[PDB]
Design a protein around this ligand. Sequence first.
Ligand code: MN
Ligand code: MN
Length: 179
Amino acid sequence: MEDFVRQCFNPMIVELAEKAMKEYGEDPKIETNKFAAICTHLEVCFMYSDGGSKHRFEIIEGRDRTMAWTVVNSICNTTGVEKPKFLPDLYDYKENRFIEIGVTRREVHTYYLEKANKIKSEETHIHIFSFTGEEMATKADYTLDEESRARIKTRLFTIRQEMASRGLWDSFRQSERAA
Ligand SMILES: [Mn+2]
Ligand SMILES: [Mn+2]
């Protein structure tokens, strides 16, 4: 799985995924399912940002924690939008809201509720994708056009297929539960 990850995702995503694990005291070599999952989440966040008009999104995810909070703080101080209790992934300048992005091997609605109860924010928008082509977003507002979301759905399905083809998919799907 380690070598699958390093050949499936681009080096920039891989490097950001390694840094992110280390800061939480995780070894990518050992926790390889976590490694794949972090890379997937990052790739989705970057695809999503790319789905809007050029300036639409401020990207929060992928940054160093301290700098991430600084940017969040600048958005909050300048738009009046409420400060989130946890780091979201993007800020949407068009809709004026933070967005938390999820990618789950479980049911979209389950993960959605877990994320929503954790954040406890009326303002923040939540948008969950699965590896089975499903999505669920706050108030059924999917932010992006259908073509942009469909590209993300396709990519996740290809990741699932590439994993199953190497016998890694069962382990990956189950691992989110075991956590
Ligand atoms: Mn995040
Ligand atoms: Mn997220």
